[PDB]
Design a protein around this ligand. Sequence first.
Ligand SMILES: CC(=O)OC1=C(c2cccc3ncccc23)Oc2cc3ccccc3cc2-n2cccc21
Ligand SMILES: Nc1nc2c(ncn2[C@@H]2O[C@H](COP(=O)(O)OP(=O)(O)OP(=O)(O)O)[C@@H](O)[C@H]2O)c(=O)[nH]1
Ligand SMILES: Nc1ncnc2c1ncn2[C@@H]1O[C@H](COP(=O)(O)OP(=O)(O)CP(=O)(O)O)[C@@H](O)[C@H]1O
Ligand SMILES: Nc1nc2c(ncn2[C@@H]2O[C@H](COP(=O)(O)OP(=O)(O)O)[C@@H](O)[C@H]2O)c(=O)[nH]1
Ligand SMILES: [Ca+2]
Ligand SMILES: [Mg+2]
Ligand SMILES: [Mg+2]
Ligand SMILES: [Mg+2]
Lengths: 435, 330, 428, 54
Amino acid sequence: MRECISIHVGQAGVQIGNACWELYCLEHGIQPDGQMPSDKTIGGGDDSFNTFFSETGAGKHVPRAVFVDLEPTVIDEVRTGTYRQLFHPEQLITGKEDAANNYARGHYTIGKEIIDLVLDRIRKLADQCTGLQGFLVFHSFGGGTGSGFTSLLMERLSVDYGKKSKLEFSIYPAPQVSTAVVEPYNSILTTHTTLEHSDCAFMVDNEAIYDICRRNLDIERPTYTNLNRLISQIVSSITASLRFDGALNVDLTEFQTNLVPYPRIHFPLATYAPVISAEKAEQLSVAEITNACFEPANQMVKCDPRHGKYMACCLLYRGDVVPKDVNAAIATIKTKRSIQFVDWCPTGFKVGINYQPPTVVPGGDLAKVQRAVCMLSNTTAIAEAWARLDHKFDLMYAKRAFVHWYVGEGMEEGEFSEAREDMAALEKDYEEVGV
Amino acid sequence: MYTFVVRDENSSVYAEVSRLLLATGQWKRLRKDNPRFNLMLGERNRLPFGRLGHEPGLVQLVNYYRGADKLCRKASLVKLIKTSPELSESCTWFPESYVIYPDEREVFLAAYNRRRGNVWIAKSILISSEASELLDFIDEQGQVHVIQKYLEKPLLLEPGHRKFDIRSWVLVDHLYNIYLYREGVLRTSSEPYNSATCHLTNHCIQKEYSKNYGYEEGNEMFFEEFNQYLMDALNTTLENSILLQIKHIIRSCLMCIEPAISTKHLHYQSFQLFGFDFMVDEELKVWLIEVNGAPACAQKLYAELCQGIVDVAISSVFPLATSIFIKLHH
Amino acid sequence: MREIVHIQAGQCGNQIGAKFWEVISDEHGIDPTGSYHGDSDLQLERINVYYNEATGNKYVPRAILVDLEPGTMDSVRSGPFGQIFRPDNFVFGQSGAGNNWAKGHYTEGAELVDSVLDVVRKESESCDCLQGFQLTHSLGGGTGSGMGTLLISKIREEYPDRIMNTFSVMPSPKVSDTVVEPYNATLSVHQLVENTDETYCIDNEALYDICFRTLKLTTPTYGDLNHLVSATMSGVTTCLRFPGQLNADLRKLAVNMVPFPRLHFFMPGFAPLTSRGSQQYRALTVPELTQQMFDSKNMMAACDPRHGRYLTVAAIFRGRMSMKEVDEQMLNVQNKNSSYFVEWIPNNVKTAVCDIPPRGLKMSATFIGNSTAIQELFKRISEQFTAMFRRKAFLHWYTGEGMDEMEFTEAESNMNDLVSEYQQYQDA
Amino acid sequence: MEVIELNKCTSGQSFEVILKPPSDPSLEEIQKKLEAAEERRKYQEAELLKHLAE
Ligand SMILES: CC(=O)OC1=C(c2cccc3ncccc23)Oc2cc3ccccc3cc2-n2cccc21
Ligand SMILES: Nc1nc2c(ncn2[C@@H]2O[C@H](COP(=O)(O)OP(=O)(O)OP(=O)(O)O)[C@@H](O)[C@H]2O)c(=O)[nH]1
Ligand SMILES: Nc1ncnc2c1ncn2[C@@H]1O[C@H](COP(=O)(O)OP(=O)(O)CP(=O)(O)O)[C@@H](O)[C@H]1O
Ligand SMILES: Nc1nc2c(ncn2[C@@H]2O[C@H](COP(=O)(O)OP(=O)(O)O)[C@@H](O)[C@H]2O)c(=O)[nH]1
Ligand SMILES: [Ca+2]
Ligand SMILES: [Mg+2]
Ligand SMILES: [Mg+2]
Ligand SMILES: [Mg+2]
């Protein structure tokens, strides 16, 4: 068995981390006190779930996770929350003051003074690993810590664990629930500095999650809790293969192998279905949920895949799903919809089925369903999100608005244009592939 | 009060549209690069569709369908009809066409040699009875061309013995209702058609050789007159002999690409105005020539048509405080 | 735990300052003796931002009272919440500043500044993480203006990486104490441009016009003006001292509100406008709160926002209301009047909501605008300054304290630079 | 249309369906960045303190 370490940075990464690890405990039958009655090997384990949990002589199942935030408010609620007993104190790292929504302050000023502490804590979890695959990094683009410190941590992880894989789960900024006016700045700065260090990154656009919670869950004013319980379902769908016995995406390397033919273009589009309101009296079929993966309204990033080219597709089913029903849906979908692939890639769908139906937080907003699918498809259409974001950067930077805050932290102005120029390369890479 | 921007100054159709909207007192115009807009009169080339539909609290609408260019480019229109099971080879209203680059050379030659009337036409503008003449003229240029069978037996307007083509304006709204403006126009040739200037009628090309003008004003004949002619000359109506086939081709083409350009479940909404160009032969058969994604209008019908755009296309999504269109159902 | 150290200097600075402390003390359920008698512990979650705990569970404001004469500070200590202030934190002289910037800044004030700094240092060194300072003062007098800016320059020297915030009261001939107020204000604005991160411009011309036109007060007094100032200061600090506010602090406000270092002079607004002792019984609708806080008649700076453009906007709604309605109501303002927002700063309007309303209002809204129309305020002061300075009138009051004419010429030039700079970004 | 590599097990199964064949900075370099930023911070601050000293 090969272990995976999850690193949660900033407010978004920490709170989404809470949602995910709560759901993992429900999916694996682990109590808030870490006790797992189903596990029959106490203190030791070669099981599938041991890639994410370690075991103490007392039978306690401890997540292979570290939580990092520059200010203590968000992690303190984890320290006193309903899963306080799960994590041990060393895994929770906080400072006294945040990055003030400033990439430079998270990377340069405040990052340098805590980076070594975080690495040592990380090393102490790797010591307990007989075979480390790599890391899963959760963070936001727009936060000063999520963007700034994360990029610095990704630089050092490539140094201290060159052989290991690193996957990102990134929150793309949306005005509907954003925080700072400079989030486009921080998004481009961190994407430029992290690009060569991330093997595969799943962006989640808060706009998409927000609109799904409004339409499908009938929540008027969605909260971070609403968004995170839904985001955690998607993250569960994506990591389930690492945690449950299976044959598709059994290690982090497979994510790059099956979803990233071109290294720089490593942002798969995620689509989920079905999302059903809890306070409701219809069970969707396999064809129906499979076809739903090709509706814009169900995508983690809003964009139109009809006008891009596919490079890879994965279908991850959970619940009552048998292969024949999947092929009957695919052949039925391939005809009516235009799924154009790139010439140098086969029109193929890698499929994975897990029999345990999706788990939903008791009393949450999502209803329990008999079958769900998460499609991972690397489309050029996601370049629409880079273009949207780069334009907002161009509007502010053309006046040099707010730049003095970054330069005051020691960052040179040239890093801005150097970052923007990298993004302009990224966009042209997408266009050459999409034609 | 609603807001709109303008990003195509050259458009004569939407210059009138903006003028009508402002007059209503319930629409305000904003600078080109202002994102807080309800409506966008976008540019012809590389309109930034990817930036629409991401403004909280703003229903956004644009006067183009992304991807509808596959119908309005000659190389792609031919491709659309050949590779679409909804069109050919059952399609009998599109002139036999081939796309060759300066495929489909081999397939074109086989059809020509096998036919050996063989008068073709290459466009992206040559008309030859020998296949060899067309290609030599094509390789000179660096743009892709389509070879198409020239209609040797076109319907001729008498008196004058002259060729003509029909322009039909079609409007598609956010619901994908297909609206055919009741007023069409024939673009006729002043020069009498000669089998061996008068072969091409584009008005602009007609002023170059002003043989005749005010059989019709500006070489334009509208349906009321054209219909009377068909009744008196051929004992038929414009509706039965020609319009039934136009409505079919219009329906056929737009329902084909509907699942690829529809904005039913999109974060922004689309509508567009198309200019279909038809030919009519000796036996009152209608032929689809081309589809224009950004057409102009005939001065006589500018007011009526542009008003109808506001009524069915704009105010239908942004309402204010008998129709001139023919709804083609589906 | 991010502490703020509050400083109030001079007559005006101590009067609004005192009014500010009794108002927020009531909002947190802190009685005049410093003991908490509230009902909800939401009042105590972030009470440390402004209060120390000391012993016996008695909260003491983190406040320093400075003045060059004792008169106003004796009045504070006589007041109802006068006993709440730490007595060691009263720092005063006897000479006075005679409405003379030079006396506050170079002569009289210099003799006493080190004593203030000793109290500041005492408060700062017991802070788990000091986030910055807020100073209340006027610019038309001598102590708050001349000595106030001297403190700010010396505080920055000792705490160069902390946020400096001020509540600055701009003079007006409509509410004038002496003819030299334009001299004192011009000299001070030059200091504020260099040494503050955020200044709330509180214009006595606006406060007077609101009291006379909107509130129908024939003869408004400083008490009435300070009632408007009191409600504003409570509004623009709500997010700093109540929970569930995204950990809002002074630095994040400056980062998002100030796109250029010199253009950090905010226009405050408040709704509904309420007179002292004039309490009305129907609460405003969210549409009403939104319209009035963007209305010129609710601005505390005396500038027409339609004469310029918003670089950034922060608003806070207080009370039990429909947040969804709050969202729709704010979005329509930007979508309706998108011409008054610079298009080169996307999403430059932030909205916050707090469930706890202020005393005597079921709901209210406070406006913080970074508008280029603020240039109207500095142009007004510039014209007054120049009308006297072109005849060197009343200057002997300043040259007799050691100042030279050149220093006036330089303050005049800098303020005119500030004006033309605001007009630069009104182009877009 | 075509199915390959069908893997079954207790928890579920996975397979691939084909429909069409196809047609480095070091640790010290990071320090030379972080320390270069700290020095620019301290230079700009010395320009301030010296300005205040004037
Ligand atoms: C949004 C919030 O909950 O608080 C914040 C306030 C705030 C808002 C209103 C009144 C205030 N008064 C004092 C201090 C902060 C505020 O500033 C901000 C102003 C902003 C103004 C424009 C764009 C973004 C902003 C973000 C903040 N921003 C970033 C993190 C937290 C806060
Ligand atoms: N989906 C989701 N998004 C979040 C959450 N928390 C914050 N965000 C988003 O993250 C962005 C703000 O970044 P934060 O993570 O809060 O900032 P940070 O990493 O703590 O860095 P600082 O600037 O120091 O606070 C905004 O775009 C928010 O919408 C969350 O819990 N769920
Ligand atoms: N296959 C064919 N048979 C007969 N006539 C043809 C023809 N192809 C083109 N034409 C003639 O040429 C005109 C159509 O030209 P075409 O539409 O290809 O040019 P164009 O597309 O640049 C003008 P528009 O702006 O309307 O699109 C008509 O006058 C018609 O008589
Ligand atoms: N709004 C308000 N303005 C005041 C108050 N007291 C004085 N002022 C104004 O402040 C200026 C006088 O300065 P003042 O504070 O009295 O002088 P100082 O004691 O030297 O600081 C004039 O512009 C007055 O109009 C007050 O209580 N409220
Ligand atoms: Ca075990
Ligand atoms: Mg934070
Ligand atoms: Mg044509
Ligand atoms: Mg006085």
